[PDB]
Amino acid sequence: EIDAMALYRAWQQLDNGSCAQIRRVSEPDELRDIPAFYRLVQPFGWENPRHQQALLRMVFCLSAGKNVIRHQDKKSEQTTGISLGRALANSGRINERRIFQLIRADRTADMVQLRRLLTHAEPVLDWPLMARMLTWWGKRERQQLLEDFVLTTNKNA
């Protein structure tokens, strides 16, 4: 599997030039057109083709900014940390229909919209969990995102 917190820590300590250069993409595959990307994700097994798609997604989200996604470790009590959907709902900045139209959005349409949401919401979340979600990213992980969002919003009210 792919080490998450390592990739996060690497992203937090990347040089601002590479950082700004990466942020500039507008689609995950465009990261392939950038050197700084390869140097970033090579220590984490980019060289193994199984892990590639995943990495492309992870970095893309991270590309929202050096400190848009705020990692926070899970409390020892809880079995899992704060998932993405809960984070977004907790932001108070995201509208339900953005999430709805997110999970119904096509490969690719999908990541772009997510990144927009991330920059807008600047969420605090358990990053490796997000990373896993991005590793698989299929119908049920999307649907789970919508679940967490809706259910958290209802809980909190």
């Binding site: 259910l151 958290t152 209802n154 809980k155 909190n156 009210a157």
Partner: protein, 218 residues
Amino acid sequence: MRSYLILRLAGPMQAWGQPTFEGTRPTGRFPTRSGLLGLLGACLGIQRDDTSSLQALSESVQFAVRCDELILDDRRVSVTGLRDYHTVLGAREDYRGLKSHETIQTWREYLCDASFTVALWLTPHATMVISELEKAVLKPRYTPYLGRRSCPLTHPLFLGTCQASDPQKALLNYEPVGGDIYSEESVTGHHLKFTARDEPMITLPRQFASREWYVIKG
């Protein structure tokens, strides 16, 4: 959707009881149902034998209690506790007649630095209306206290009146926000409950039945 009455129970010392037939008189961490019914009772000058009025009250009203933490000069002050070595001399030895013990002893527990915000509402089978309760809490007939009579209130019993769908929603309008809530009504996102023996059995004096609070953590 529903109209709520909002009360504040605050004083230097409070005491809200738990099952005991002994000389130690325990407290829990927040108002008991029985006790809130008693507070309202005192406001609505209800004598202790008036089983009709007591039952009407009990069937009409339901509560939700929020535990407010104190903040002094930007620091948090946790609710703590207290045990009073409480003595009685010349105490009755028996229920009939006048023989008495030289000294008996009791131990009574109190809550220190505690404050609560309570929301109460009416049931569908209500014999009462909220206007009454408001009038009473503003002008009580019997002396109102926080658990025991030695426990004055440091803030008016009346806090406000409003309207919402949850108790949770109702309580949101009133500072301080953030405390835990124990409600007699379920709130959708929340699944934990908390067992107690609050419920007064009015037909059987000074005996209480089990019930369950719904917990809304903050």
